[PDB]
Every structure is written in C-alpha cells, then in structure tokens.
Amino acid sequence: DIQMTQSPSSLSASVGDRVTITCRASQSVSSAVAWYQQKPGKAPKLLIYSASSLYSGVPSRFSGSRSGTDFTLTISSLQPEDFATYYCQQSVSYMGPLTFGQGTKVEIKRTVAAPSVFIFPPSDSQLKSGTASVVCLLNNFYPREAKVQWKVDNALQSGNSQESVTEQDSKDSTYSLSSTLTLSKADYEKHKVYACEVTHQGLSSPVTKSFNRG
Amino acid sequence: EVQLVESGGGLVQPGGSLRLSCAASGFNFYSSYIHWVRQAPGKGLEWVASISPYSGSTSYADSVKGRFTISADTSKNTAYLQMNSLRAEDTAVYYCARYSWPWVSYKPYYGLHFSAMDYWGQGTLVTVSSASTKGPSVFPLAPSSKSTSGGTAALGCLVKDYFPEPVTVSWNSGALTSGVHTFPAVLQSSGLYSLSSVVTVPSSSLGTQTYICNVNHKPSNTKVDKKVEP
Amino acid sequence: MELDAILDNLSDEEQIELLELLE
C-alpha cells in the first residue's frame, strides 16, 4: 500500500546534539505527514502536523520539513527527556488507510556510570510456598550492556535465570537491570552461597554480591 | 479539557469478541474523525479503523476487515470498536484518537493543512490468550544486612505468578516515588508473569521507616500491601 | 476551506491530483 520507511531504526546522541529522523513515503502523500513522540507505556504525543507545523505547546527544538516524498523530523538541541520512540504517519488518503513507519528509538548518550549491585534472598514466605527466587539488582548504570552471572556455591548457573531492563531514565539517562534466579525449595536448601557477579564497562573488575543461605 | 477515555479491554480466548469504547469529553464529537490505533507489545503503531461519527462513514485496515466494526454514538460522544474472531496477533494496546475536522483544508495564500492525531486516550490492553486469569503473589525483597548505616540501601517487592498484564506498583501508597524502578514483567515457564519493584532509600531509615509496596492487579481484582522489613 | 466533502467523492488518484494542484 502506501509505506512510510523510517530510517535509522535507532540512534544514540548526546545532550545538545542535532538529530535528524527520516521518513520516505513510497509515493506522494503531499504534506499529510505527522510526527509523534512516544515514551514507554504512554500514548503517542503529537509533535508535528501537516509536515512542518509545530503543534501547540511543543518545544521549538522539534521541527519538520518536507522535500518531495522525504520527510525529516529534526531535534536541533537534544535533551535528556527526549529519550523516546518517534513515528511519522501519513494521512493522504481521505478516510483511507493511515500508515506509520516503524519508529526511531532515540537513546541519550551520557558518561559511563557503574551499576550499584544488590542481592536479595528468597523470603521465608515464598519458600513456604515451595519455590525460591533470588534477585540481583543492577542500579543506574550506563552503557546499557551488562553481564550477570549467577554462581551457587561457585558453580556457574545456566538456564535458571530471567532478566529485565528498565527503559532509559528520562532524567539521568541510566538503565537498571533485574536478574531472577529460580530454584526449587529443595534445590535451594541443598546449597549455601548464592552470588551475583556483574560485568560492566564502568567497573574495572567484575563485582560480586553474595549471601549465605544460613 | 479534551479527553479520550478508553474501556473494554482485557483477556479473551482466541476466536472470542470484545468491545472497546472510547468516551470523549472536551470537544465537539460531531466535528471530529475518530481512529483506533493499536500497538502490539514492543512493536510499532498500526492504524486499525476510522469513523466519521455524524455520517457514520467508516474505514478499516485490511488486517481487521470483516472482523472489526467501528461505530459511534454522537449522543454519548462515544466511539466503539467491536472486535470479533480475535487472534493472538490482535494482542495489543488499543488507542482511541481524534482528528479535529476538517481532515484537510485549503486556505488561499497559505496552502494545505492536514489534521493530525492531537488527542489520544491512555489506551486499553487486549490480550488474546487461552491462559487463565490469576492474581499475583507478593514477596519482600528485604534490604541487606550487609550494610552500613551511612549510605544507600535498596529494598523491593517481587510480584509473581499473575496473568494477564498489567500490574501497578506504588510505594507507601504513593508517598515515595523517587528512586523507584518497577521492572518490565517477564513471562515465567508457568505461563505467568513476574516482576520486581525496587527502591533505594537512606540506609539509616531501615527498620524505623516503614516501607510498603502497594500492588494492584485489576484483571483479577487483587490488591496486596506488602510491608518490607530487613 | 474544508476539502473533506470534495475528496470523499474523488478517487485516491484524483485526490492526490487535486491536492498537488493546490500546493
């Protein structure tokens, strides 16, 4: 049909940088192009309408331009709160299909920050239910790439862990990670030392946070 | 002011039906176009349907033709999306949004002006699954004994074995918001979700200051308050 | 002025031809 091809699918830039996002329409869409900003878990917010008009209340650093079938969203002075996914959208078909464009994830680039590492044993409450979740928390680090290795009485674990990463913080530009190690109450009681060992660019050496079951 | 409030989403088995409603408040509903736009978890925006509420003219994406029906009641200023024959790929957050009329205008010496989606509702989650609704279990992530009393500590709550999404977590009935990280849920091998919500607090506060996570899972009508002690 | 009533009775190709005349 009518496709909006949105290049780069993702980009990373520093505070104050100029960033440009592109949308090529597969055919003429006139100026029927809007630009939206979507932060995680929220509805998209209109930034640009009719390809070049700044929506009321939007910061002036957002602007849209058109050249033929190419549409450009420019963020002239990148702010930390601009972490988001941006989408173009065409509406050239009156009461016809509206198409979007795959989006652009904009991450904010900041100085390297090491994670604060904590470990949490299972509650007695959960053990009374028959399973054990051991949680390792990595707090407020940046770059997003980080490795967590679980060690139970120094044996490396594999296949019994699940991770989750927060979205980039809109104010300090950091990430946080949660690693959960799952064991049965029996296998949990059959061992003593539960350790979370963390590798990250901000750490000279991998950092281990441990506890003993007793 | 202008508001769009969506209703009717939830968990539904494959092949079933749901009806989303979108109640509009601070604008002329007769003078608008209403769109349903959906987003599958972690994916992009996909337009679903459009309606002109006064003339009742409609348009549909090919993905939903014959299965979905958009309608509107100008008396109630409320638009509707009736979804039949739902499939797993229909799982998404469904958003209501608005064009103010006209779709496109022309003004001499200034050109064309195309409307855009300026007001969106908060969205309603539709999950197409055979899995069953289950309320969560809440466990404390107790702040460590391996500890000083002069810096920062972390504590939290584990919300596990629930379905479907979402879960909301607040701290101290909302009084504590700074330093909170509520993580994206992961789906466990049980077929149920599990997440953590943690906070960093002054390490000196522990044991004196009371820390309660308030977990609400509306799909199951479940509200649990867990006090987190060392 | 509003163009919706005009475009509702034009084909997609006619619509874009009109819109491009008005640019």
Coordinates of N, CA, C and O in Angstrom, one line a residue, chain C residues 8-19:
Chain C
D8 N -14.1 13.1 -0.5 CA -14.9 11.9 -0.3 C -15.5 11.4 -1.6 O -15.9 10.2 -1.6
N9 N -15.7 12.2 -2.6 CA -16.2 11.7 -3.9 C -15.2 11.6 -5.0 O -15.6 11.5 -6.1
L10 N -13.9 11.7 -4.6 CA -12.8 11.5 -5.6 C -12.0 10.3 -5.3 O -12.0 9.8 -4.2
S11 N -11.5 9.7 -6.4 CA -10.6 8.5 -6.2 C -9.3 9.0 -5.5 O -9.0 10.2 -5.5
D12 N -8.6 8.0 -5.0 CA -7.3 8.3 -4.4 C -6.4 9.0 -5.3 O -5.7 10.0 -4.9
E13 N -6.3 8.6 -6.6 CA -5.5 9.3 -7.6 C -6.1 10.7 -7.9 O -5.3 11.7 -8.0
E14 N -7.4 10.8 -8.0 CA -8.0 12.2 -8.2 C -7.7 13.0 -7.0 O -7.4 14.2 -7.1
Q15 N -7.8 12.5 -5.8 CA -7.5 13.2 -4.6 C -6.1 13.8 -4.6 O -5.8 15.0 -4.3
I16 N -5.1 12.9 -4.9 CA -3.7 13.4 -4.9 C -3.5 14.4 -6.0 O -2.8 15.4 -5.9
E17 N -4.2 14.3 -7.1 CA -4.1 15.2 -8.2 C -4.6 16.6 -7.8 O -4.0 17.6 -8.1
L18 N -5.8 16.6 -7.2 CA -6.3 17.9 -6.6 C -5.3 18.5 -5.6 O -5.0 19.7 -5.7
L19 N -4.9 17.6 -4.7 CA -4.0 18.2 -3.6 C -2.7 18.8 -4.2 O -2.3 19.8 -3.8

